[PDB]
Structures are given as C-alpha cells and as structure tokens.
C-alpha cells in the first residue's frame, strides 16, 4: 500500500510478429469486446486479461482505490522470448521498452519502468541496458530465472551483470518457462509449484555461481518471496558443507553467508510465511509486490503486511515503500 | 534421539539382477576395499556407501552413541525399480522385504521395517502389502512421490490406498527420479532443490486428487518437512481458490483444510524452518527423521529439536518419539 514492485503491463497492441520476424510461437493480443481481451499462443489461447492490463488510466484508478502510490512496471514474462533469434528479441525489447517509457512519461510520479532485455545475446543485452537506464531513465530491468540452457550462474552472463553493476541498474528476477507438459499439466502446478522452484534454483545458481561474490554492489530482487529458498536454505546450506566437491568448485562461500545480500518480494500470501521471510531474508530486504493485475497476486496490496501485529510502524513502512526505494535507488 | 522415522539400509549382497531378469538398468552393490561399497547403475559407480549402510551391528553401535532408540528401516529409493516389468520388481521387493524382515527380527526392540512395493502394478502391490503386514509384520511401506507417468492422484493407484487403509498400513512417501541432467546437473540441485519440489507435488497431488477425502484414515508421512509445502501452502491455497476450473475439479476443499491430516518428517536443518513446520503441520504431526546414513541427513539426531527453546518438554518428546508411535500404530 505505497509501492508495488511486481506489476505487469502490456502495450494496447503490437505488430503481427509471425510477419515482422517470420517464425511462429510469438504471443499476440486480441480484444473481442472492450473491457476484456485474450492472450494467444499463435496456437490456442493462454490467458484472459482485463482493461487494467494495458490502460494506464484504468491502472491509476484501481491504484487510488487500493492506496498504491507507485507501481514498478514490467512486461508480462511470456514476452521475454529468450528462445528466438537474438536480433528479433532486441527489436521486441525496443518496442516494449519504449511503450513502458511512454507510460512513465504520462504519470512520472505513479510509475517506474523495469526494462526487458535480449538475455540470450549478452552484448546486445548490455547495449539495450545502457539505453534503458541512460536514455529511458529506467531504475532497473526485469529478467527471467534462466535464459534457455543458461542458468544465472553462466559466464556468458557476467558481462550483463558487470554492466548492471556499473550503471547502478537493479534486477528483478522473475520465474518463467517452467515445464508445462507431462506430470505438470494438472492442478495449475507449473504456477503453484513450478514457479517457486525456478526462483529457488535461481538464487542457488547465483550464490554458488559466484555472482554475488564477483559483484558485491549488484541489486537483485527475486519474485514470490524467493520461492522455496527461505524455507529450504538450511538444507541448501548443509548440503554445500557436506559436498564441497559438487557445490563449491565455483564459489567457496556457504550460501547462508548471502542472507542479507539480496531482496525478495513479499508475495507469499500467509502471515507465518511472511514472518519467516523477514526473519531469514531481513526486514530491510523484503519488498511489497502484488503481481498486479493477475488473479494469483495480492488483491489488497499491503493488507497482509498491515495485519502483522508483530511488526512495528517503521518495519511496515520499509515493507510497503522504504525497501523498494533502496532497491531501485530512488528518493521520496 | 528417540525414534528415527527416515533411514535406509541395503542387504550386504544380492543377485546380479541383469542375469536374473534378462535386461539391465538395475543397481548392484560391489565390495572391493574394506569398510566401503560401491553402488553401480549400468555403467558407473554413482554412490559410495560405508558399512553402516548394510551391517546392523554397526548401526546399533552408532544408535547407542547418538541416543537413537529405534530406526524405521527402508530400502534406498534407487531400488524402487518402478520402471521394470511388474513381475521382476515384485521379485526384487520380496528379496528386499525379506532382507529387511531378517534385520528387524534380530533386533525387534531397535528396528521396525518399512517395506517396498511394485507400485507400477497396483494388484501386485496390494498382495505384497498384504504379505508385508501379515507375514512380515511391518507397520508400513515406503513409496516414491510418483510412479513413472503416474502421480499420487492416479486412479490406478487407488486400490493400493484402499489396501493400506484396511490393513492399517502407514505410508512413507520419499521423493526420487527427479530430473538429473540438463539444467539440474550442477551444484547438487536435484537433491537440494529437486527433492523438496517432488515432495511438494506429491502433497498437492494427494490433496487436490481427493485421496485424503476418499481415505480419511490413511496415514501418510512425507520426507524432508514436506519439501516446500509449509512455506508455499499460502500460494497453493490461494491459487486453488482463484482458479477452481484448474484445481478443484477433483476435490472441492481448500488445501488448508488438510493441514493436520498428514505427517512430515522433521528433516529441515534450521530452527526457523522447524518452527514453521510445526506451526503449519502441527506439533502432533512432525516426526524426527534423519536420512541416516546419508550425508544430507541430520548428523546429530534430535539435536535441532533439543536446541529449540520455545518448545516445552511434552512437545519435544512428541517430535522425538510420540508422533512416530502414533504414525506407526505401535506402543512405547
Ligand atoms: Zn509476475
Ligand atoms: Zn532418504
């Protein structure tokens, strides 16, 4: 109920992409009757969205009802398209990034921009990042938990991290691209269970991969309370200690030592989980996030943090806003 | 430091299974240098185990040292063999359950048996359960978190649950046959992360699949504090409520209602995680588990429990023994 770090938005419309680029599997927007719209596989449909998902005035109203001062805006993670030709992803990223920037120009004290980047091609990613920060004025970028077969430990990605750290650019890591078929096709598991596992893998990849060691000024936030990590850190840490041969031939420091070194969003739904999240990650490093406007997110942003009779007013305020300005390097 | 619900043992020797069944993929134990054996799965040595993994005299000695009174013994999960022809698995289970039954009979005050079954052939698995419970006197069985393409919701598995329920045969679910390659082939991810995820999926499959509603008296314990479940139950519970088309099509109750309906082992490593586990699952439903003799387990069994200064004594003795006794259906 002050700043929402995790909020997704799309342009009203965009070019046909199977044409602009050639090949398929790209995602499009079809509005049938104003108020509602549909997201489409190329093949068959995969999400029914509302007016809030593209219309910034609709967004501000809802934000006024809900007490939300600013939303950090990123794209819908399905847009990442790390799987496609690189130069084509650079294109889409420019389109999405300029629309995002355009939305911030209309309401520069209600919105900020988290850019997107062609991560599968590190040096283009670097350039599109100098641009996001220095021309567009974005305070960070949103990226995926893994990039194809690369995980966030990859050496191929170190140039990007170096750049993030150079240009003071924050990173919001969003899980995406779980397994959808076979055992995971029922009960909404890729979302309910697959997303948290992707985030947990991402935190590990980075800690054990050397990233936080080789870039101590990097600002990283993970989605969904960082998945399973706050709860399974004990196991990850003890395992690092038992098999230094499987786990440390890349960075020798125990994962427990980077508690304090990264942020997570507070989208965990339960008070007991929120409490644990703050005891493990820290009161300074947890950030309110809503996943607005999707049904799986928090419906009353901050309602859970406000109900925590054990936090004091200072702590509730780091959670609703204070920690988020730190992470993005902004001022009130 | 009283009862250990989670512990594995192998026979010292077993026949060459390729020879016995006509095709490979099985594991063998080789004894080459002293106090040590190699497990090979067609090709490679994939694990080196010490004598405490097969020799009950040795286990008794370490139990004497650690203050453990009973270990509930089960085979190593790699032996589940759910992939083989249904007759051969059945043959192997009889060998392993007999070995198990022999160990137990030599020390029926220090061990209880958890048998193994040909899960991929539900009829064959009901007979072996009959035999484990009636002939062999085991209080329960150990099974995997999934059976090939089936998950714990599968209908074909239902006659098995009906058997266990009739027979007062407890179920101990252990994760296995998680992806080992690709992105999961570094930093021991399949064990640090993949295993907790497999168990979160199983708990989801059993709840949303109706299993606890169909069989209100089935008792089930899950390995490793139930994986990620206790921290991510909010997200599972909320998403269930948000998308009943995907989630409530088999069982109309929110997952939260099934808290208290199943057990988990206490193998979570940190006090904060333990405290959450019993806040969420309940003080009467967490069992001391150790994963002896593998190095990912608790090295000083009970020590995480005994260190917890918030728990009264009654609570500690529940987590150390009472809960295990209720879950197994036995007496002090
Ligand atoms: Zn999101
Ligand atoms: Zn185990």
In words, what does this structure look like?
The structure is a homodimer of 332-residue chains. Chain A contains eleven helices and 13 strands. With 332 residues, chain A is α/β, with parallel strands linked by helices. Chain A has a single domain, classed as Metal-dependent hydrolases (TIM Barrel). In chain A, strands 1-5-6-7-10-11-12-13 form an eight-stranded parallel β-sheet. A three-stranded antiparallel β-sheet of chain A has the order 2-3-4, with no helix packed on it. In chain A, strands 8-9 form a two-stranded antiparallel sheet. The longest helix of chain A has 21 residues, at 86-106. The radius of gyration of chain A is 19 Å and the shape is globular. Chain A starts with a strand and ends with a helix. Bound molecules: zinc ion (ZN) (2 copies).
Strand fraction of chain A: 15-25%
Instruction: Please give the CATH class of chain A.
Output: Alpha Beta
Total number of domains of chain A: 1
Listing every helix as H and every strand as E from the N terminus to the C terminus, the arrangement of chain A reads: EHEEEHEHEHEEEHEHEHHEHEHH
Largest sheet of chain A: 8 strands, parallel
Percentage of helical residues of chain A?
25-40%
The CATH homologous superfamily of chain A is termed: Metal-dependent hydrolases
Q: What shape does the CA trace of chain A take?
A: globular
Helix/strand-derived class of chain A? Answer: alpha/beta
| Tally of separate helices of chain A | 11
User: Can you name the CATH architecture of chain A?
Assistant: Alpha-Beta Barrel
Distance between the termini of chain A: 15 Å
Say what oligomer this is. Answer: homodimer
CATH topology of chain A: TIM Barrel
Supply Rg of chain A.
19 Å
Total number of β-strand segments of chain A? 13
Q: Strand order, main sheet of chain A: write it out.
A: 1-5-6-7-10-11-12-13
If interface size is counted as residues with C-beta under 8 Å from the partner's C-beta, which chains form the largest one?
A-B, 50 and 50 residues
Bound molecules: zinc ion
